């Protein structure tokens, strides 16, 4: 099932491109020319179908063509339709005959949908569209991810013989990391449940596999054991995806030229703070909460006083169970993973003691009372008093100091300090903001504990980046959480479109190769209505928060008048005062602007921060490590949204400096079913990942864009006599390398500062390089061992006089007996 | 006196006097003489490697007439590589050394050839 | 499964690679007695 607004977007994106030539030279129809069409009752009666394969009847009509439905089978009734709804179709072409989408004769919307339809359903999810690679979510393991396949792509010589896969990319990324000595980055793109998190793991498992077994896997151990903990703590069950990433994951890894991760740095950002406190129906909280209140041992069930999964206010009691998920078995694996992260049993117990404390504090009921003089002044319940006292001793904090910052209103003006009392709703917020900060700082403390052991001393030089973000997510009700997620996705896209198209277009032109233009759709307008400083949905939110007399309703109005033009901002038809729509790359998304200012502000007070910093427990102190204790009005750098965008901004430039690689994950259906094709949902994703737009890049011809220097480092072994040749110039060096290896004048091209080469002759040079690489892989390894040999020999030679005393005293002992 | 008495000496070093050497250290040991097997031949090797098997493998696979044949590449042999550019190939490819790299060049001595390196390594062994 | 769709690469022994269903992408050689002519341009519908 797919929603009408999804259908709305899916319908609009289709467009007639290339004219149909289903007519013979004389003036009659061919022997049944087949064409795709959007007109047929099967398309009307079913959402999943947008186009049917119809064959033109042997009759006539050149002006208003006659057709019969063939795929799927129809009534066999000959119906007439307009040629504007006729798209050219390839019939002789086999979908499993080739990997690159750009190899089709007709590359129109339905022709690409079908080429991907027959690949997915025959269980070949990976399809290239160079530089891009399309991975459709199969929803079932095909075994193509196992160690056997890793080893194949790893030890296989010719890249040409190998079929499209996440490993094809993982190897070509690592082929440049060591080939030219440039930092590379892998980017998993796609909507909520497309397969980003899973694909990251596969490419991580690829780098984990080493050719030669002589490596220190102690660092590589914590790196891999972190992921099932990061999914327990950071991932939660949603209606869109049951393992939905509520945090953004970014890695930096130093991998060996044979394989295996030497060092790493997992840097996680923006954790869905609201998911801890409140969860929607059929939607579940972070896996670790349910894992710990199911799989905990009898000792932790009495020491912490653990209750059932339903008994907690911070946990949805009806959504408690997930299909195909055994939170007990996952917990077993989580505990061992914590051990592998060099955490002691004492360090692990405290991690769960804080989690037990968070859960317990949530259950405590704050009620109204006739105190302070202004009434409604909150009070901790008499029966829930012992519940609160146990929770504060579970999180290792002073139970009277935490009670004071939540119940007593501490406000300091100028010099004179003023004492009061917080109201019922206000104290519930202080209780909630405390649980939110304890969980987020703990989750990030595990990241810090990991990075403490896995990080390289003296940073990274030539590392491998990997970016697992939260994909586009649309629900019935979308809020600030959903706003920040969809912003991330649009940001990743802006930088994608720039690198892949805008930069490449300028590169070929500046080098003096192709003056031709690249046609593509950018989010330039929609990214600015959200991220352009001064004039954007994010900047107007910050202005409303920093302003004292600013409301949630005043914010919508602030956007509606300023961001009126450019279309990308459209205020809601229903309750415009509290709702607004954004024209995303996935279509229109409506956000209920309720609590937008409150959510953006939610970051724990300096008053409670001091209590957690003064803790008698070391782990509890280390949570708020070097944290600015702030009192009064919230600063622009303390505001969640402002703190989010600046973190995102910095991360993008870090990625722009490297050589990115794109993985475009497609979610075929919402029903979460294998071998189920839904043309609307897929088409939107074919646009939103710019798969159809990536076809224009065929025009370039050349599949190698590197400077004379970059060519001379990766390739010089072909003939080191003309490569090291100091007299001849570098422009003349590169061309002579191709002369010895032998090339036709069509494969290579001069270039101003760059060296342009078509993929056609690329592998021909790479294999000629490998023929001189292997004879030098062993030549290096023989001399390298012949010295390694004499290192032990010379070290032994100095110990010979000391051994001559052991033996002389042994001979002495043999004389006595 | 001959290779037979020198092979045994080399095992007790790479094994660190162990009876059963680890597969990875056995490859260091064979290479230290001038022995490299094909992808197939390197799979034909036993699970647990011992002194008795090592010495049989030594006789069969070691080059005697020209101890280091594998160093010779005649396009790479006659050619002269500068000391700095040579270390460039070494530092990127390296699977062993750390600072014993400076000591290899001392075993040879600005522009060097592979026939010079092999000749010096024949006297090293 | 009794039969797989394969493809000759580059003879008394064919350099075939499994295409339908997708395989390891390994080019293996087999006897022509186990090679049956296949229609490719032909649509089943
Ligand atoms: N390569 C794959 N093979 C099989 N199933 C997959 C694959 N990738 C993803 N899935 C399925 O998709 C679900 C969600 O995947 P995930 O990567 O966590 O998505 P997201 O990008 O939303 O975090 C998994 O639970 C699994 O069933
Ligand atoms: O479900 V997601 O991990 O794509 O947010
Ligand atoms: Mg993802």
- CA–CA dist A681, A9 (Å, integer): 9
CB-CB contact of A670 with A1 (8 Å) = yes
Breakpoints of chain C, after residues (C–N > 2.5 Å): 10
Query: Dihedral through CA A155, CA A157, CA A160, CA A165, nearest 10?
Result: 10
Helical H segments across A192-326, by residue range = 196-208, 218-233, 274-277, 287-295, 300-303
Per-residue DSSP letters for A439-459? HHHHHHHHHHHHHHHHSPTT-
Minimal CA separation from A161 to chain C, in Å: 6
Helical H segments across A124-279, by residue range = 147-155, 166-179, 196-208, 218-233, 274-277
Residues of chain A whose beta carbon is less than 8 angstroms from a beta carbon of chain B are 178, 181, 212-214, 257-258, 719-721, 724, 775-793, 796
Instruction: Tell me the CA distances in angstroms from A60 to A77, A87, A396, A760, one per residue in order.
Output: 15, 18, 85, 44
Report the run of H or E that residue A419 belongs to, with start and end: strand A416-419
Structure tokens at A148: 């056997």
Instruction: Tell me the CA distances in angstroms from A753 to A124, A186, A734, one per residue in order.
Output: 40, 27, 12
Q: Which residues of A touch B89 (CB under 8 A)?
A: 776, 780
Structure tokens at C27: 């080019």
Q: Which residues of C touch A127 (CB under 8 A)?
A: none
| A657 burial level (CB within 10 Å; 0-12, 13-18, 19+) | exposed
Structure tokens at A30: 């061919």
Comparing CA positions, the residue from A460, A455, A463 lying closest to residue A222 is: A455
- CA–CA dist A786, B122 (Å, integer): 10
CB-CB contact of A252 with A463 (8 Å) = yes
Give the Cβ contact number of residue B46 at 10 Å.
10
Ligand 1 site-directed mutation target among A120, A136, A137, most atoms within 8 Å of CB: A137
Structure tokens at B65: 């007439």
Give me the long-range contacts of A771-775 (CB less than 8 A, separation at least 24): A772/A717, A772/A718, A773/A717, A775/B73, A775/B76
Comparing CA positions, the residue from C43, B38, B19 lying closest to residue A54 is: C43
- CA–CA dist A650, A495 (Å, integer): 13
Indicate left, alpha or beta for A394 from its phi (over 0: left) and psi (-120 to 50: alpha): alpha
Structure tokens at A77: 């009734």
- CA–CA dist A312, A635 (Å, integer): 34
- CA–CA dist A532, A539 (Å, integer): 8
CB-CB contact of A568 with A452 (8 Å) = no
CB-CB contact of A229 with A442 (8 Å) = no
- Give Cβ neighbours of residue B34 (< 8 Å, ≥ 6 apart): A782, A786, B62, B63, B67, B68, B69, B70, B71
Work out the angle between the directed axes of helices A287-295 and A345-363 (0-180°, nearest 10).
Answer: 100
Rounded (to 5) percent helix, strand, coil in chain B: 50, 5, 45
Half-sphere exposure for A110 (CA within 13 Å, toward CB): 25
- Give Cβ neighbours of residue A252 (< 8 Å, ≥ 6 apart): A264, A265, A267, A460, A463, A464, A465
Instruction: Tell me the CA distances in angstroms from A667 to A112, A141, A672, one per residue in order.
Output: 16, 15, 9
- CA–CA dist A179, A160 (Å, integer): 18
Report the run of H or E that residue A35 belongs to, with start and end: strand A34-37
- CA–CA dist A272, A286 (Å, integer): 10
The answer, yes or no, to whether any atom of ligand 1 lies below 6 A from the CB of A78, is no
- CA–CA dist A318, A325 (Å, integer): 16
CATH number of the domain where residue A501 is located: 1.20.58.530
Experimental determination technique = X-ray
CB-CB contact of A723 with A712 (8 Å) = yes
Per-residue DSSP letters for A69-132? EEETT-----EE--GGG-EE--SS--TTS-SBGGGSS---HHHHHHHHHHHHHTT--EEEETTE
CB-CB contact of A546 with A724 (8 Å) = no
CB-CB contact of B58 with B3 (8 Å) = yes
Half-sphere exposure for C4 (CA within 13 Å, toward CB): 13
- CA–CA dist A541, A547 (Å, integer): 10
Nearest neighbour of A775 by CB, restricted to B73, B103, B104 = B73
Structure tokens at C13: 């022994």
Q: Which residues of C touch A123 (CB under 8 A)?
A: 21-22
Structure tokens at A706: 């590197």
Residue A472 DSSP symbol: -
* Residue B19, SS3 per DSSP: coil
Structure tokens at A338: 């914590």
Rounded (5°) CA angle A706-A134-A202: 85
Comparing CA positions, the residue from C25, C45, C3 lying closest to residue C34 is: C3
Cα B72 to chain centroid, rounded: 13
Structure tokens at A525: 């307008």
A384-419 per-residue burial string, b: 16 or more CB within 10 A, e: under 16 = eeebbbbbbebbbbeeebbeebbbbbeeeeeeeeee
* Residue A733, SS3 per DSSP: helix
Cα dihedral sign, A19-A20-A23-A25: positive
Residue A516 DSSP symbol: P
Residue A696 DSSP symbol: G
Helical H segments across B15-82, by residue range = 23-31, 51-61
- CA–CA dist A463, B121 (Å, integer): 36
- CA–CA dist A810, A302 (Å, integer): 63
Indicate left, alpha or beta for A158 from its phi (over 0: left) and psi (-120 to 50: alpha): beta
Nearest CA in chain A to C9: A161
Q: Which of the other chains make 3 or more beta carbon contacts under 8 angstroms with chain C? A: A
Give the Cβ contact number of residue A618 at 10 Å.
11
The beta strands (E) that lie in A550-683 are given as 569-571, 579-584, 587-592, 659-666
**φ, ψ dihedrals at A729, nearest 5°:** -80, 155
Which of A255, A775, A785, A793 would best serve as a mutation to test chain B binding (most B beta carbons within 10 A)?
A785
Instruction: Tell me the CA distances in angstroms from A245 to A62, A192, A331, A652, C31, one per residue in order.
Output: 53, 8, 18, 19, 51
- CA–CA dist A228, A560 (Å, integer): 43
CB-CB contact of A586 with A361 (8 Å) = no
A194 assigned to a ligand binding site? yes
- CA–CA dist B56, A89 (Å, integer): 66
Rounded (to 5) percent helix, strand, coil in chain A: 45, 15, 40
Nearest CA in chain B to A181: B92
- CA–CA dist A440, A433 (Å, integer): 11
| A585 burial level (CB within 10 Å; 0-12, 13-18, 19+) | buried
The beta strands (E) that lie in chain B are given as 20-21, 49-50, 81-82, 111-112
Cis check for the bond before A72: say yes or no (omega within 30 of 0): yes
Cα A22 to chain centroid, rounded: 44
- To one decimal, the resolution in angstroms is 4.0
- CA–CA dist A172, A166 (Å, integer): 10
Length of chain A: 817
- Give Cβ neighbours of residue A103 (< 8 Å, ≥ 6 apart): none
User: Which residues span the domain enclosing A503?
Assistant: 481-658
Minimal CA separation from B104 to chain A, in Å: 6
CB-CB contact of A91 with A62 (8 Å) = no
Task: Give the sheet arrangement for strand A569-571, strand by strand.
Answer: A569-571, A579-584, A587-592
Q: How far apart are the first and last CA of chain C?
A: 22
Ligand 1 site-directed mutation target among A193, A232, A272, A469, most atoms within 8 Å of CB: A193
Minimal CA separation from A672 to chain C, in Å: 23
Taking the centre of ligand 1 as the mean of its atom positions, its distance from the CA of residue B119, in whole angstroms, is 58
Strand partners, A253: A264, A464
A191 assigned to a ligand binding site? yes
Rounded (5°) CA angle C8-C12-C16: 20
Half-sphere exposure for A730 (CA within 13 Å, toward CB): 13
| B104 burial level (CB within 10 Å; 0-12, 13-18, 19+) | buried
Cα dihedral sign, A584-A589-A593-A599: negative
- CA–CA dist A518, A179 (Å, integer): 29
- CA–CA dist A468, A201 (Å, integer): 10
Report the run of H or E that residue A402 belongs to, with start and end: helix A399-407
The answer, yes or no, to whether any atom of ligand 1 lies below 6 A from the CB of A194, is yes
- CA–CA dist A426, A376 (Å, integer): 10
- Give Cβ neighbours of residue A48 (< 8 Å, ≥ 6 apart): A2, A669, A676, A677, A678, A679, A680
CB-CB contact of B61 with B29 (8 Å) = no
Comparing CA positions, the residue from A164, A267, A163, A150 lying closest to residue A204 is: A150
Structure tokens at B76: 């790479």
- Give Cβ neighbours of residue B71 (< 8 Å, ≥ 6 apart): A779, A782, A783, B34, B114, B117, B118, B121
Taking the centre of ligand 3 as the mean of its atom positions, its distance from the CA of residue A112, in whole angstroms, is 24
- Give Cβ neighbours of residue B31 (< 8 Å, ≥ 6 apart): A778, A781, A782, A784, A785, A786
Per-residue DSSP letters for A314-339? TS-TTT---TT--HHHHHHHHHHHHH
Does the distance separating the beta carbons of C21 and A161 come in below 8 Å? no
Taking the centre of ligand 3 as the mean of its atom positions, its distance from the CA of residue A144, in whole angstroms, is 19
C16-27 per-residue burial string, b: 16 or more CB within 10 A, e: under 16 = bbbbbebebbeb
Residue A311 DSSP symbol: G
């Amino acid at each position: 099932a797919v929603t009408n607004e999804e259908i709305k977007t899916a319908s609009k994106i289709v467009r007639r491109v290339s004219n149909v030539e289903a007519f013979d030279k004389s003036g009659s129809v061919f022997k049944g020319y087949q064409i795709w069409t959007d007109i047929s009752p099967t398309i009307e009666n079913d959402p999943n179908i947008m186009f049917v394969k119809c064959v033109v009847q042997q009759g006539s009509k050149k002006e208003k063509l006659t057709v019969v439905q063939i795929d799927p089978p129809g009534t066999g009734t000959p119906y007439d339709i307009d040629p504007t709804h006729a798209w050219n179709c390839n019939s002789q072409v086999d979908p499993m005959s080739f990997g690159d989408i750009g190899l089709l004769n007709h590359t129109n919307i339905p022709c690409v949908l079908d080429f991907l339809k027959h690949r997915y359903l025959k269980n070949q999810i990976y399809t290239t569209a160079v530089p891009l690679i399309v991975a459709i979510n199969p929803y079932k393991d095909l075994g193509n991810t196992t160690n056997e396949w890793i080893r194949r792509y790893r030890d296989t010589a010719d890249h040409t013989k190998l079929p499209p896969h996440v490993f094809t990319c993982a190897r070509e990324a690592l082929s440049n990391l060591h080939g030219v000595n440039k930092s590379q980055t892998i980017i998993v793109s796609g909507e909520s449940g497309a397969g980003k998190t899973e694909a990251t793991k596969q490419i991580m498992r690829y780098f984990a596999s080493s050719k030669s077994g002589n490596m220190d896997l102690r660092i590589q151990t914590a790196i891999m054991a972190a992921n099932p903990v990061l999914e327990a703590f950071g991932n939660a069950k949603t209606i869109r995806n049951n393992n939905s990433s509520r945090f953004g994951r970014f890695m930096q890894l130093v991998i060996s030229h044979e394989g295996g991760i030497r060092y790493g740095s997992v840097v996680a950002f923006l954790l869905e703070k609201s998911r801890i406190i409140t969860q929607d129906d059929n939607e579940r909280s972070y896996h670790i909460f349910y894992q710990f209140l199911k799989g905990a041992n009898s000792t932790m069930k009495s020491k912490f006083g653990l209750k059932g999964v339903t008994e907690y206010k911070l946990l949805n009691p009806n959504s408690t169970e997930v299909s195909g998920v055994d939170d007990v078995k996952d917990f077993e694996e989580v505990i061992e993973s914590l051990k592998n992260m060099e955490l002691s049993e004492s360090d692990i117990e405290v991690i769960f003691s804080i989690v037990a404390g968070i859960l317990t504090l949530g259950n405590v009921r704050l009620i109204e009372k006739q105190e302070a003089g202004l009434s409604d002044a909150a009070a901790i319940m008499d029966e829930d008093m012992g519940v609160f006292n146990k929770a504060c001793e579970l999180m290792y904090l002073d139970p009277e100091l935490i009670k004071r910052e939540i119940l007593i209103k501490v406000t300091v003006a100028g010099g004179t300090k003023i004492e009061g009392r917080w109201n019922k709703n206000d104290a519930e917020v202080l209780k909630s903001s405390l649980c939110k900060a304890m969980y987020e700082k703990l989750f990030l403390w595990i990241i810090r504990h990991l990075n403490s052991r896995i990080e390289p001393e003296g940073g990274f030089k030539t590392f491998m980046g990997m970016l697992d973000i939260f994909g586009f997510e649309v629900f019935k009700n979308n809020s600030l959480e959903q706003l920040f997620i969809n912003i991330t996705n649009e940001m990743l896209q802006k930088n994608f479109v720039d690198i892949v198209f805008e930069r490449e277009s300028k590169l070929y032109k500046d080098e003096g190769i192709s003056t031709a233009e690249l046609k593509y759709t950018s989010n330039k307008e929609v990214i600015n209505v959200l991220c352009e400083k001064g004039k954007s949905v994010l900047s107007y939110l910050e202005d409303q928060c920093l302003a004292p007399g600013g409301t949630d309703e005043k914010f919508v109005s602030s956007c509606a008048t300023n961001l009126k033009e450019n279309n990308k901002f459209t205020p809601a038809k229903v309750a415009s005062n509290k709702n607004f729509i954004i024209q995303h790359t996935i279509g229109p998304i409506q956000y209920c602007a309720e609590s937008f200012l409150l959510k953006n502000k939610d970051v724990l007070r300096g008053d409670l921060v001091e209590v957690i910093k003064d803790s008698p427990n070391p782990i509890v102190q280390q949570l708020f490590e070097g944290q600015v204790i702030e009192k009064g009005k919230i600063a622009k750098g303390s505001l969640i949204g402002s703190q989010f965008l600046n973190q995102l901004t910095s991360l993008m430039n870090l990625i722009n400096s490297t050589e990115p690689h794109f993985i475009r994950c497609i979610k075929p259906n919402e029903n979460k079913k294998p071998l189920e094709w839904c043309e609307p949902k897929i088409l939107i994703q074919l646009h939103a990942l710019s798969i159809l737009e990536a076809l224009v890049l065929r025009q370039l011809g050349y599949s190698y864009r590197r400077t004379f220097e970059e060519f001379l480092y990766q390739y010089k072994f072909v003939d080191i006599a003309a490569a090291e040749d100091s007299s001849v110039e570098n422009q003349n060096k590169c061309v002579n390398i191709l002369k010895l290896s032998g090339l036709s004048e069509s494969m290579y091209k001069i270039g101003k500062s760059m060296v342009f080469l078509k993929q056609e002759g690329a592998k021909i040079l790479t294999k000629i390089q490998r023929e001189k690489l292997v004879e030098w892989e062993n030549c290096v390894s023989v001399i390298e061992a012949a010295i390694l040999k004499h290192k032990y020999k010379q070290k032994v030679n100095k110990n010979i006089p000391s051994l001559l005393r052991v033996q002389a005293h042994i001979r002495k002992k043999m004389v006595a007996q | 006196s001959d290779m037979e008495e020198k092979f045994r000496e080399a095992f007790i070093l790479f094994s660190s006097c162990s009876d059963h050497i680890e597969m990875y250290k056995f490859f260091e040991l064979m290479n230290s003489f001038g022995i490299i097997l094909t992808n197939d031949e390197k799979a034909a090797l036993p699970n647990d490697i011992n002194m008795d098997y090592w010495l049989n493998f030594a006789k069969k696979h070691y080059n005697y007439e020209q101890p280091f044949k594998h160093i010779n590449n005649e396009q790479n042999t006659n050619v002269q590589i500068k000391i700095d550019n040579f270390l460039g190939i070494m530092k990127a490819l390296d699977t062993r050394l750390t600072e014993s790299d400076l000591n290899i060049l001392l075993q040879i001595t600005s522009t060097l050839n592979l026939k010079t390196v092999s000749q010096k390594l024949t006297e090293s062994i």
